[PDB]
Design an enzyme around this catalytic site. Structure first.
Site, PDB file in Angstrom:
ATOM      1  N   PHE A 196      37.884  29.355  28.615  1.00 57.05           N
ATOM      2  CA  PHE A 196      36.618  29.319  29.367  1.00 57.05           C
ATOM      3  C   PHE A 196      35.520  30.170  28.706  1.00 57.05           C
ATOM      4  O   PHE A 196      34.334  29.956  28.965  1.00 57.05           O
ATOM      5  CB  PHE A 196      36.841  29.782  30.821  1.00 57.05           C
ATOM      6  CG  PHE A 196      37.607  31.080  30.981  1.00 57.05           C
ATOM      7  CD1 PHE A 196      36.954  32.307  30.912  1.00 57.05           C
ATOM      8  CD2 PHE A 196      38.975  31.074  31.233  1.00 57.05           C
ATOM      9  CE1 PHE A 196      37.659  33.504  31.062  1.00 57.05           C
ATOM     10  CE2 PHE A 196      39.679  32.273  31.387  1.00 57.05           C
ATOM     11  CZ  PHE A 196      39.016  33.480  31.302  1.00 57.05           C
ATOM     12  N   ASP A 243      41.196  20.371  40.008  1.00 58.24           N
ATOM     13  CA  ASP A 243      41.955  21.481  39.406  1.00 58.24           C
ATOM     14  C   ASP A 243      42.313  22.601  40.429  1.00 58.24           C
ATOM     15  O   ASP A 243      42.228  23.795  40.116  1.00 58.24           O
ATOM     16  CB  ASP A 243      41.234  22.039  38.154  1.00 58.24           C
ATOM     17  CG  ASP A 243      42.093  22.902  37.238  1.00 58.24           C
ATOM     18  OD1 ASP A 243      41.520  23.625  36.394  1.00 58.24           O
ATOM     19  OD2 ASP A 243      43.337  22.881  37.388  1.00 58.24           O
ATOM     20  N   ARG A 296      45.481  30.031  40.720  1.00 60.46           N
ATOM     21  CA  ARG A 296      44.693  30.660  39.645  1.00 60.46           C
ATOM     22  C   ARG A 296      43.183  30.386  39.832  1.00 60.46           C
ATOM     23  O   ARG A 296      42.366  31.164  39.353  1.00 60.46           O
ATOM     24  CB  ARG A 296      45.175  30.184  38.251  1.00 60.46           C
ATOM     25  CG  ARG A 296      44.718  28.773  37.869  1.00 60.46           C
ATOM     26  CD  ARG A 296      45.462  28.177  36.689  1.00 60.46           C
ATOM     27  NE  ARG A 296      45.928  26.822  37.005  1.00 60.46           N
ATOM     28  CZ  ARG A 296      45.243  25.709  36.758  1.00 60.46           C
ATOM     29  NH1 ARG A 296      44.059  25.767  36.154  1.00 60.46           N
ATOM     30  NH2 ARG A 296      45.744  24.527  37.099  1.00 60.46           N
ATOM     31  N   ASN A 297      42.823  29.289  40.534  1.00 59.66           N
ATOM     32  CA  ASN A 297      41.432  28.914  40.780  1.00 59.66           C
ATOM     33  C   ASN A 297      40.951  29.284  42.182  1.00 59.66           C
ATOM     34  O   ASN A 297      39.937  28.756  42.652  1.00 59.66           O
ATOM     35  CB  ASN A 297      41.203  27.438  40.457  1.00 59.66           C
ATOM     36  CG  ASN A 297      41.209  27.163  38.977  1.00 59.66           C
ATOM     37  OD1 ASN A 297      41.101  28.070  38.142  1.00 59.66           O
ATOM     38  ND2 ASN A 297      41.296  25.902  38.613  1.00 59.66           N
ATOM     39  N   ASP A 316      36.164  27.119  39.871  1.00 59.37           N
ATOM     40  CA  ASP A 316      36.443  26.238  38.737  1.00 59.37           C
ATOM     41  C   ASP A 316      36.161  24.760  39.052  1.00 59.37           C
ATOM     42  O   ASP A 316      37.077  23.981  39.313  1.00 59.37           O
ATOM     43  CB  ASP A 316      37.862  26.463  38.172  1.00 59.37           C
ATOM     44  CG  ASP A 316      38.134  25.930  36.776  1.00 59.37           C
ATOM     45  OD1 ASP A 316      37.204  25.364  36.157  1.00 59.37           O
ATOM     46  OD2 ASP A 316      39.273  26.092  36.294  1.00 59.37           O
TER      47      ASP A 316
HETATM   48  C1  LIG Z   1      39.865  39.126  36.557  1.00 57.75           C
HETATM   49  C2  LIG Z   1      38.621  38.598  37.238  1.00 57.75           C
HETATM   50  N1  LIG Z   1      37.901  39.351  38.020  1.00 57.75           N
HETATM   51  C3  LIG Z   1      36.835  38.657  38.494  1.00 57.75           C
HETATM   52  C4  LIG Z   1      35.757  38.966  39.336  1.00 57.75           C
HETATM   53  N2  LIG Z   1      34.858  38.046  39.650  1.00 57.75           N
HETATM   54  C5  LIG Z   1      34.907  36.799  39.171  1.00 57.75           C
HETATM   55  N3  LIG Z   1      33.864  35.931  39.532  1.00 57.75           N
HETATM   56  C6  LIG Z   1      33.888  34.546  39.486  1.00 57.75           C
HETATM   57  C7  LIG Z   1      33.122  33.821  40.413  1.00 57.75           C
HETATM   58  C8  LIG Z   1      33.181  32.433  40.364  1.00 57.75           C
HETATM   59  N4  LIG Z   1      33.933  31.831  39.438  1.00 57.75           N
HETATM   60  C9  LIG Z   1      34.654  32.535  38.571  1.00 57.75           C
HETATM   61  N5  LIG Z   1      35.440  31.854  37.656  1.00 57.75           N
HETATM   62  C10 LIG Z   1      36.238  32.547  36.633  1.00 57.75           C
HETATM   63  C11 LIG Z   1      37.356  31.664  36.060  1.00 57.75           C
HETATM   64  C12 LIG Z   1      37.906  32.390  34.823  1.00 57.75           C
HETATM   65  C13 LIG Z   1      38.491  31.516  37.091  1.00 57.75           C
HETATM   66  S1  LIG Z   1      36.643  30.044  35.614  1.00 57.75           S
HETATM   67  C14 LIG Z   1      37.983  29.097  34.825  1.00 57.75           C
HETATM   68  O1  LIG Z   1      36.303  29.350  36.812  1.00 57.75           O
HETATM   69  O2  LIG Z   1      35.619  30.269  34.639  1.00 57.75           O
HETATM   70  N6  LIG Z   1      34.623  33.873  38.589  1.00 57.75           N
HETATM   71  C15 LIG Z   1      35.931  36.426  38.289  1.00 57.75           C
HETATM   72  C16 LIG Z   1      36.923  37.354  37.952  1.00 57.75           C
HETATM   73  N7  LIG Z   1      38.059  37.333  37.161  1.00 57.75           N
HETATM   74  C17 LIG Z   1      38.480  36.129  36.405  1.00 57.75           C
HETATM   75  C18 LIG Z   1      38.360  36.255  34.881  1.00 57.75           C
HETATM   76  C19 LIG Z   1      39.804  35.522  36.877  1.00 57.75           C
END
Ligand SMILES: Cc1nc2cnc(Nc3ccnc(NCC(C)(C)S(C)(=O)=O)n3)cc2n1C(C)C
Length: 300
Positions: free
Chosen positions: A27, A138, A142-143, A156
């Site tokens: 991503f 999806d 994890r999402n 996601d």
């Molecule tokens: C560890 C971690 N702490 C987070 C705090 N806030 C968000 N904020 C958001 C808000 C909305 N969408 C997403 N998507 C992140 C994603 C890696 C799951 S993806 C595949 O949708 O880009 N993150 C994402 C965070 N993460 C991810 C990398 C899992």
């Protein structure tokens, strides 16, 4: 049909600061950040997403389109975009990360009330996506992101292939409906009920289609009463119309959430606790003075 009047907010690079990396994969890279707008006297905790090929920019912008078009308490919304050389997505910070890692890391304190409420919340988010004629494609643990242990949101929409979470019609005929999302919801519930176990562990992805056609499904989790497991099983019928609707799942899980110990049997339940605003220093780096969550700032 209906015109999409969603607002796409363009944000200045200078208005926000990157603090640390939260995750880095396919991503791209996600950063923890603060957004200090114009002169509003507010500091919004944010999550900044960034991947320079013209093909890549098109994909990050198609995801921004879907994400800026949704507005629900149980669905992740886009706050805005920053038009830098690469292109950055500014999202709400979900401090506790994804639900999959959260149930793995906190299994010893996850009680029946939390598991059943997360099920309601995911069903509510999915029912909103259904009302908006949006098919996720999806949905997995994890999402599902954790704002607070008592508040989760679906994310996601970069697909709105994960075989082990897909419905039979999706694997064999590439058919994706709101009913095929119900199958994925069933696997998501299984992931939670097993505290983050991998579905069909050891089994290769190509054998899944053959296994499903035979009638084989995911096993009954030890904490699951036949009541909860029957719901998971109903999410995995061949006939998609026989599968429950997300509105039925909201009702069924919420009835269960009223007497959680009757539907999930967990050793240590009642003596278990997870962080909540009741905790001293729940919100805890430097300046935490004029900090406000995105859900309370501006509001669409
Ligand atoms: C560890 C971690 N702490 C987070 C705090 N806030 C968000 N904020 C958001 C808000 C909305 N969408 C997403 N998507 C992140 C994603 C890696 C799951 S993806 C595949 O949708 O880009 N993150 C994402 C965070 N993460 C991810 C990398 C899992």
């Amino acid at each position: 049909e209906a015109p999409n009047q969603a607002l796409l907010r363009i944000l200045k690079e200078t208005e926000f600061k990157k603090i640390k990396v939260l995750g880095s994969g396919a991503f791209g890279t996600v950063y923890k950040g603060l957004w200090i707008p114009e002169g509003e006297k507010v500091k919004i905790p944010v999550a900044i997403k960034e991947l320079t090929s013209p093909k890549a920019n098109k994909e990050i912008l198609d995801e921004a389109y879907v994400m800026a078009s949704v507005d629900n308490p149980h669905v992740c919304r886009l706050l805005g975009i920053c038009l830098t050389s690469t292109v950055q997505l500014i999202m709400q910070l979900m401090p506790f990360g994804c639900l999959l890692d959260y149930v793995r890391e906190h299994k010893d304190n996850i009680g029946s009330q939390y598991l059943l409420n997360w099920c309601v919340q995911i069903a509510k988010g999915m029912n909103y996506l259904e009302d908006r004629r949006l098919v996720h494609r999806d949905l997995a643990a994890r999402n599902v992101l954790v704002k607070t242990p008592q508040h989760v949101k679906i994310t996601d929409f970069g697909r709105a292939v994960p075989i082990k979470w897909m419905a039979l019609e999706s694997i064999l005929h590439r058919i994706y409906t709101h009913q095929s999302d119900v199958w994925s919801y069933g696997v998501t519930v299984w992931e939670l009920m097993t505290f983050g176990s991998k579905p069909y562990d050891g089994i290769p992805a190509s054998e899944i289609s053959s296994i499903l056609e035979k009638g084989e499904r995911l096993p009954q989790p030890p904490i699951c009463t036949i009541d909860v497991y029957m719901i998971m099983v109903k999410c995995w019928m061949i006939d998609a119309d026989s599968r429950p609707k997300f509105r039925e799942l909201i009702i069924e899980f919420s009835k269960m959430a009223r007497d959680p110990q009757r539907y999930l049997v967990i050793q240590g339940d009642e003596r278990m606790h997870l962080p909540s605003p009741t905790d001293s220093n729940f919100y805890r780096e430097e300046d935490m003075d004029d900090v406000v969550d995105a859900d309370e700032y501006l509001i669409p």
